[PDB]
Amino acid sequence: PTESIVRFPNITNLCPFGEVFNATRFASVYAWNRKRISNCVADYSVLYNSASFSTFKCYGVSPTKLNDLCFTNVYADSFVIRGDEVRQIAPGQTGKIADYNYKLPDDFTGCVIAWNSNNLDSKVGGNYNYRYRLFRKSNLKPFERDISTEIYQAGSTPCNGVIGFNCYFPLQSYGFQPTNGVGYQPYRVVVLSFELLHAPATVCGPKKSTNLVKNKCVNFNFNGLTGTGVLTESNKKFLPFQQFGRDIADTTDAVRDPQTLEILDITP
Amino acid sequence: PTESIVRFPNITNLCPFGEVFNATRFASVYAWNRKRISNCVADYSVLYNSASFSTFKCYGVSPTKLNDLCFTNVYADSFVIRGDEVRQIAPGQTGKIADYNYKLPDDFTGCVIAWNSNNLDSKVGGNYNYRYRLFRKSNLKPFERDISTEIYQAGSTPCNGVIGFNCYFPLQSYGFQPTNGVGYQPYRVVVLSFELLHAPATVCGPKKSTNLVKNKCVNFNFNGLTGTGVLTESNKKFLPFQQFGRDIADTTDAVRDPQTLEILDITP
Amino acid sequence: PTESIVRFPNITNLCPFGEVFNATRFASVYAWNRKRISNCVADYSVLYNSASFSTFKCYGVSPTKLNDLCFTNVYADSFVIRGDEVRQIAPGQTGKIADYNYKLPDDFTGCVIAWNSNNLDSKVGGNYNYRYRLFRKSNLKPFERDISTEIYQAGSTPCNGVIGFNCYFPLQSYGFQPTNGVGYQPYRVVVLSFELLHAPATVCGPKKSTNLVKNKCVNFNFNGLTGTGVLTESNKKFLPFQQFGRDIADTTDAVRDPQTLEILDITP
Amino acid sequence: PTESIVRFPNITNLCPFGEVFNATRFASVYAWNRKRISNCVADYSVLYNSASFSTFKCYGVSPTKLNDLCFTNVYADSFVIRGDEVRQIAPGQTGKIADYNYKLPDDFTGCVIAWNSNNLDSKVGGNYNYRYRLFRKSNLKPFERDISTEIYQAGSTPCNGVIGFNCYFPLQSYGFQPTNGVGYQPYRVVVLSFELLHAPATVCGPKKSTNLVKNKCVNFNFNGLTGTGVLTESNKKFLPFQQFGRDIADTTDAVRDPQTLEILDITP
Amino acid sequence: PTESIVRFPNITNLCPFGEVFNATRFASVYAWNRKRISNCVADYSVLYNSASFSTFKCYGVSPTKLNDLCFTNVYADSFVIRGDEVRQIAPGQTGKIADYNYKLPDDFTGCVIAWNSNNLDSKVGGNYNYRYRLFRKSNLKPFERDISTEIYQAGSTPCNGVIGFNCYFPLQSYGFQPTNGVGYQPYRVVVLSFELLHAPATVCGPKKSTNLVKNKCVNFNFNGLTGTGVLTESNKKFLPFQQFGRDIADTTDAVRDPQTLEILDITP
Amino acid sequence: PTESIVRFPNITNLCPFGEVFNATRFASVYAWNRKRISNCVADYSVLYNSASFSTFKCYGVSPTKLNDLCFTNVYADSFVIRGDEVRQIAPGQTGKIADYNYKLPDDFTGCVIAWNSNNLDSKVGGNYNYRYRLFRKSNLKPFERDISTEIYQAGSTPCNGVIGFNCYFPLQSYGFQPTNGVGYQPYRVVVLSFELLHAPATVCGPKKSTNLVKNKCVNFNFNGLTGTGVLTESNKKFLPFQQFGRDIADTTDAVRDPQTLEILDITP
Ligand SMILES: *[C@@H]1O[C@H](CO)[C@@H](O)[C@H](O)[C@H]1NC(C)=O
Ligand SMILES: *[C@@H]1O[C@H](CO)[C@@H](O)[C@H](O)[C@H]1NC(C)=O
Ligand SMILES: *[C@@H]1O[C@H](CO)[C@@H](O)[C@H](O)[C@H]1NC(C)=O
Ligand SMILES: *[C@@H]1O[C@H](CO)[C@@H](O)[C@H](O)[C@H]1NC(C)=O
Ligand SMILES: *[C@@H]1O[C@H](CO)[C@@H](O)[C@H](O)[C@H]1NC(C)=O
Ligand SMILES: *[C@@H]1O[C@H](CO)[C@@H](O)[C@H](O)[C@H]1NC(C)=O
Ligand SMILES: *[C@@H]1O[C@H](CO)[C@@H](O)[C@H](O)[C@H]1NC(C)=O
Ligand SMILES: *[C@@H]1O[C@H](CO)[C@@H](O)[C@H](O)[C@H]1NC(C)=O
Ligand SMILES: *[C@@H]1O[C@H](CO)[C@@H](O)[C@H](O)[C@H]1NC(C)=O
Ligand SMILES: *[C@@H]1O[C@H](CO)[C@@H](O)[C@H](O)[C@H]1NC(C)=O
Ligand SMILES: *[C@@H]1O[C@H](CO)[C@@H](O)[C@H](O)[C@H]1NC(C)=O
Ligand SMILES: *[C@@H]1O[C@H](CO)[C@@H](O)[C@H](O)[C@H]1NC(C)=O
């Protein structure tokens, strides 16, 4: 191959990562806010090169390569937790946050971002506006939220909606102090889950497209699908929903152009 | 003086310190339990010799000399706190327990007995039945309790007694676990308050009453009234409520016998 | 398989776990006490459900699946160690307790049960009755107890049976106090070690036996020997010590019934 | 006394305490910033009401009585130091800040106001902008500022104006991290200094100025001069520099009215 | 007064502060080594100005003024303790060291000099040669040395020279390691006690003797006795053991010259 | 095999570890000193048996098996750090010392030796002769040394080589004190890296050389190459740079003796 032919869709607007990562108030972990990111371009090397983030652990994908991939959808989950609970935001972990507040699936393709927010979220005299669910009958399914406020019966006696002996309120405040220990500062956590459905991808990295070159052995990056071959005109009539064609060997024979919406036939 | 004579009333019922120190369940610090001890002989040797009481700080009375004195009324304040906040139970300190839960007066005459109770008040998974008042409008008065449960407004919004943003429950749980450190481990605290007024003493030690030896220079202890003199037979007509007697110079010159109700002149 | 058949020997006495776990005085770690448990029914549910054991770590056996398995004999090793020495009671770990006091094998099968015992093993002023072996020439073998009290020759000079310079006593006191931190607090440790030999299993869980079903395909648990097959009456004669009849293919072909003493061939 | 009279000069402007306490960037402790507060009304109650301040130690004047008094001049000193070194801002105290950076007089009249400033002064990657003088040949005199950057010589070898072995820069960077403990936490300290010398007082509390009641026995606070008397007219020839007279008994008997510049007589 | 006359005895030999402080191995605190120091010039500013001692806290005398004083005898008591126990070497303090190992009288006059000794007194694997007395029936008297090794009876059972249950060895090892914390770190402590009683002075400071001038008003420092007066010839026949002279007014009116053994009349 | 033949060359001098480990002064971590050790005998068991080395971690070799295997060349890297960043001297670890001062490759072969030096590298009042590189624009490559003293521009403004606002000096002082904590105490670190490139061995340990026995199946160690064979005589034409010889089977079959320059055929 001589030169790569990158074809990405003609998207003009950047993804609203700034509003998600720089918002004034984040939600509590029991009622975490999920934002749907779609139909835009997202720069992921801005997040990595910024040294504000204490944690940038990515599972199932590499953080440096994130600008080269087109995901179908992005879900951004934002909440505030304790410092010692940051390690519970991982696939296959146990604890109060993992079981009762935010559960990550084992088959997780995404990145976990955690930065210290002692400056903006903590307050002297106590910031008790951040609460976490401490009591639940059963553990949470992955990507499930619990906003219930029913009194957790921890004994034989019914509670009748009144707090007291063995009847506790399900949500407990953190009590954040600026004079707290290293494990007790507020941490804002944004979990970026990359949905990779077999669909037209709408969140692409910031890569400049290259105009189409055919009839020669070239590299190509069609919607994040890297390959090498000769691109020719395809007689095959793809259905409108269909975006890829798979041979008997499960390798893409043809791809629908993401800019001019035509069919190109890949040959080795 | 030749010999020492001690005359006490013939009270043989032992004071209920077993109910105070060996109760199955204590109460929370916001609703600390007060017990009135009177009209019994008190044994403070069993408190002093015990090898479980980590803190035995006595204010206004010597801890070794608890057995010698006589009092009228004893107030036992039992509650459960954590280790770091045991130091707040003293005259003149600040903190959440001192300001909003239990305040000791600066003129406190009594002892503070604190011992670790990690085995009885901690449960694996958390023992949340012990609560403390965390928010209050104004600091507490000495020997004042606040068992009201009203939602504390921490902002400028009238939120109608529903927990949420800037409206917090007044009581917060300790959440005791056996794995927690000694700063956050349960400590049972019994505060003994002795009041010595111009009243006949009802709480005394187990000091034996000796025989009445008159017309000799003896050291004497009549119901806690120590001194030296030559006790003889009197002709004064005390009224039944009148225990001792005073001269023109406001010095004790006659006492009533605790046992046989006989008036004895103390000449020096 | 249509039905499930469980056959266990008709033994009814409970195993003396109460004597092991609720004893008033535990021995020191250098002279740890091993008790042989056999010929009884062991209910491991009462250990698991109760919330006092801070550390409950099983190696080689799933902790929640203790009830269904049958063991030949159980050895319970009890001792007292401080909080930072709890992590050394594990296979493959190092430390003073692992090298000189109690060493577990790398192939250990069983559970480690450690709970805080600050009330029973600490007195104010120091509880020095719990000693650990501090000096030894060589590390201990697995499950080997050393109670020798010769003076340790640290230097090049003969000790001559007197403590002095470069000659130390091998045992050293913990010195527990209730004010000490959780690293220096008493923990009572019971190590359950299960052996699975060719002997008949005597320590079985609280699972209840069912009726024997013959000539039909069932799923059977014969005294811990799980399997599936058509149980049929056999003409095989087993010697009294022999309990099962593995063939040339190392698969269980016949089992002696633990109650009625019947030889039962298994057809797949 | 029939009533109370408070006569203060007709000063309208509020004191610029917003530009001192809420300044964007404080100076370092080696070059601490001193601001002269005069000719304005000062409200010290609003400083005491805020719970942001973690240290409000006032020496020689009580914090509750701050609004009552009047002063001629206020010296507002501001700097940033770590949490462990807050205690060295005290009269008759020793330390690095006391010897080399900021020394208070042994008889100091004012308030040391220190609050935690983690949110304003810390940043990720460390805020090293705040420097403290660590090396000096001699200890600092009280209220003396040293901004010399000469290289301190520790050994006999002359430094020659370059950094090297035994020749160190006199200023050391603090190294404030958001993840540091409370010991190394950035704290902003404001040291208010008051002069009690007799002069025309320019700064007073927010107390309302009442009318002038003559020939009736009233309490008075004439520009901070507390007393009780019958305020009558005077025929004394007060010169312009003379603000309050005195008698042969060295007691205050004639005070100039601050608003009218009219001499009044205090009659007991 | 015109001149100042210092007369000290003609001694030149320096007493071994080097052997006290720079010894290779010190002694344990239960068997602290006391050395008698007499007939020497002692340069206390060598110990004061050297940046080697972490603590140089002096009781009853100023450390800077020690060069200008003369004492009859100096006791140097050297031992090794831990960092947290350095505080306990003081009058009116409690602990294990103060009660059982080294006790200081309440009228103590001297200095306590403590410096860290990590490289000398620690070893990887534990340095156990430094022992402290942990058990004693009664508290120690001031300056009492106890080197007895008898088994402490902490219970009712006789011990009979065998260590075991409730029978402990009285000496307990520190167990120093170089990786230990600064509280558990080996500190060498030397306590200097000065006999200021009425006796011939032997230990004197490095002040140089000046020539004797008579019949004028001069300040004088005769063997550490300071005054102002006129020195003249005296007819008082002193007995050879007598140094000072005194009258009914309890004032020193005659002294003996340290060098010429001449009796001088101090006329004021 | 019958006996083992260990053949080491005729080397008489010892490797100069004395000034590497027991030098009076060490260099700082930014200017880490490197010493090349070759052509001598090194006794690693002296370092192994030392009672002062707290950390003796090794990578790519066993800490027990370092003496018997002998290496081509030894690079000794010496620097002083504090106790917290001892863990940062490991491959793959991230930190200030790792990124900016001393970086080890991920395939590092050798041993890290660290020991506390609080009595040598700390002085009362502070020892500031040991510096570390705090700021660098890029992370260091493995084994590169950067001693540049250029002013680190931390802001946008060009300040032209002067210290000031965001123009920090790159080096900073540890500031060791004897009373500091174990994290802030000096630790001398000697990294002993070894390369195993294709070259004749120059440093080998103190193991003695045995006489040759030919025509018998003996275990042999020919200067780091260990095998089993019948070392018969040869007739090879080995050029003087050929240390050993390999056949078509890619196995060692001819070794020239290091002590006699005689080629020996290894026959299986
Ligand atoms: C949030 O604001 C800061 C301040 O300018 C900026 O550096 C950062 O890049 C912003 N975050 C995002 C995701 O743009
Ligand atoms: C953008 O892409 C669409 C197909 O996705 C195409 O129809 C349209 O013409 C493109 N816009 C421009 C300006 O080329
Ligand atoms: C509580 O019970 C224990 C049980 O032996 C006893 O020793 C102790 O004296 C009791 N407490 C009081 C105050 O009597
Ligand atoms: C006991 O005291 C009472 C006073 O209440 C008295 O009446 C009675 O006689 C006394 N009894 C004896 C045996 O002293
Ligand atoms: C020990 O005694 C307690 C007392 O309630 C009981 O709950 C526990 O089950 C006992 N332990 C065992 C192993 O039976
Ligand atoms: C109990 O087991 C024994 C086996 O030794 C057997 O002989 C006996 O019949 C059994 N009893 C019952 C009631 O099953
Ligand atoms: C600084 O700003 C805060 C913001 O609300 C305010 O509450 C405070 O009073 C201000 N400080 C002063 C001295 O005015
Ligand atoms: C304000 O004070 C000045 C002098 O103190 C006086 O001359 C003037 O009349 C006053 N004005 C008012 C309105 O009181
Ligand atoms: C101990 O030896 C060192 C070595 O130079 C010396 O500086 C110090 O002054 C000596 N101390 C005494 C008390 O002699
Ligand atoms: C030294 O002092 C003695 C008295 O103790 C005296 O007899 C002698 O003459 C003195 N010598 C000198 C040289 O001053
Ligand atoms: C000493 O070394 C030389 C050169 O390496 C060698 O030729 C000689 O044989 C050696 N000496 C002995 C006794 O082997
Ligand atoms: C450094 O000196 C000590 C002094 O005994 C010695 O034990 C040690 O072996 C020396 N270090 C080396 C590397 O030889």
Side-chain angles (χ1 to χ4, degrees), chain C residues 10 258-261:
Chain C
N10 49 12
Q259 290 160 2
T260 184
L261 297 199

PDB file of all heavy atoms in Angstrom, chain C residues 10 258-261, ligand 6:
ATOM      1  N   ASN C  10     -26.106 -42.192  59.271  1.00  0.00           N
ATOM      2  CA  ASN C  10     -27.115 -41.808  60.261  1.00  0.00           C
ATOM      3  C   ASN C  10     -26.439 -41.398  61.572  1.00  0.00           C
ATOM      4  O   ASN C  10     -26.534 -42.057  62.609  1.00  0.00           O
ATOM      5  CB  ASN C  10     -28.133 -42.925  60.458  1.00  0.00           C
ATOM      6  CG  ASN C  10     -27.497 -44.290  60.674  1.00  0.00           C
ATOM      7  OD1 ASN C  10     -26.291 -44.408  60.893  1.00  0.00           O
ATOM      8  ND2 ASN C  10     -28.327 -45.331  60.615  1.00  0.00           N
ATOM      9  N   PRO C 258     -24.024 -45.734  52.657  1.00  0.00           N
ATOM     10  CA  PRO C 258     -23.610 -45.441  54.041  1.00  0.00           C
ATOM     11  C   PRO C 258     -24.612 -45.811  55.127  1.00  0.00           C
ATOM     12  O   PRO C 258     -24.206 -45.913  56.291  1.00  0.00           O
ATOM     13  CB  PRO C 258     -23.352 -43.928  54.012  1.00  0.00           C
ATOM     14  CG  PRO C 258     -24.081 -43.434  52.812  1.00  0.00           C
ATOM     15  CD  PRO C 258     -23.924 -44.533  51.814  1.00  0.00           C
ATOM     16  N   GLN C 259     -25.889 -46.022  54.811  1.00  0.00           N
ATOM     17  CA  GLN C 259     -26.841 -46.420  55.844  1.00  0.00           C
ATOM     18  C   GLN C 259     -27.148 -47.914  55.832  1.00  0.00           C
ATOM     19  O   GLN C 259     -26.890 -48.604  56.820  1.00  0.00           O
ATOM     20  CB  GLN C 259     -28.142 -45.623  55.690  1.00  0.00           C
ATOM     21  CG  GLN C 259     -28.010 -44.162  56.049  1.00  0.00           C
ATOM     22  CD  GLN C 259     -29.109 -43.316  55.450  1.00  0.00           C
ATOM     23  OE1 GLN C 259     -30.002 -43.828  54.778  1.00  0.00           O
ATOM     24  NE2 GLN C 259     -29.050 -42.012  55.690  1.00  0.00           N
ATOM     25  N   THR C 260     -27.684 -48.434  54.733  1.00  0.00           N
ATOM     26  CA  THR C 260     -28.165 -49.809  54.743  1.00  0.00           C
ATOM     27  C   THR C 260     -27.078 -50.818  54.412  1.00  0.00           C
ATOM     28  O   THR C 260     -27.352 -52.022  54.456  1.00  0.00           O
ATOM     29  CB  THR C 260     -29.331 -49.980  53.767  1.00  0.00           C
ATOM     30  OG1 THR C 260     -29.836 -51.319  53.860  1.00  0.00           O
ATOM     31  CG2 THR C 260     -28.869 -49.735  52.353  1.00  0.00           C
ATOM     32  N   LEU C 261     -25.870 -50.341  54.089  1.00  0.00           N
ATOM     33  CA  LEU C 261     -24.704 -51.155  53.727  1.00  0.00           C
ATOM     34  C   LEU C 261     -25.016 -52.065  52.536  1.00  0.00           C
ATOM     35  O   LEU C 261     -24.975 -53.293  52.623  1.00  0.00           O
ATOM     36  CB  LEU C 261     -24.183 -51.956  54.926  1.00  0.00           C
ATOM     37  CG  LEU C 261     -23.659 -51.165  56.128  1.00  0.00           C
ATOM     38  CD1 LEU C 261     -22.784 -52.055  56.993  1.00  0.00           C
ATOM     39  CD2 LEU C 261     -22.893 -49.917  55.703  1.00  0.00           C
TER      40      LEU C 261
HETATM   41  C1  LIG G   6     -27.962 -46.717  60.802  1.00  0.00           C
HETATM   42  O1  LIG G   6     -26.739 -47.121  60.154  1.00  0.00           O
HETATM   43  C2  LIG G   6     -26.325 -48.454  60.495  1.00  0.00           C
HETATM   44  C3  LIG G   6     -24.990 -48.683  59.826  1.00  0.00           C
HETATM   45  O2  LIG G   6     -24.001 -49.073  60.769  1.00  0.00           O
HETATM   46  C4  LIG G   6     -27.394 -49.459  60.063  1.00  0.00           C
HETATM   47  O3  LIG G   6     -27.007 -50.761  60.485  1.00  0.00           O
HETATM   48  C5  LIG G   6     -28.745 -49.094  60.667  1.00  0.00           C
HETATM   49  O4  LIG G   6     -29.757 -49.946  60.145  1.00  0.00           O
HETATM   50  C6  LIG G   6     -29.101 -47.639  60.362  1.00  0.00           C
HETATM   51  N1  LIG G   6     -30.350 -47.271  61.009  1.00  0.00           N
HETATM   52  C7  LIG G   6     -31.385 -46.744  60.348  1.00  0.00           C
HETATM   53  C8  LIG G   6     -32.596 -46.424  61.171  1.00  0.00           C
HETATM   54  O5  LIG G   6     -31.346 -46.537  59.140  1.00  0.00           O
END
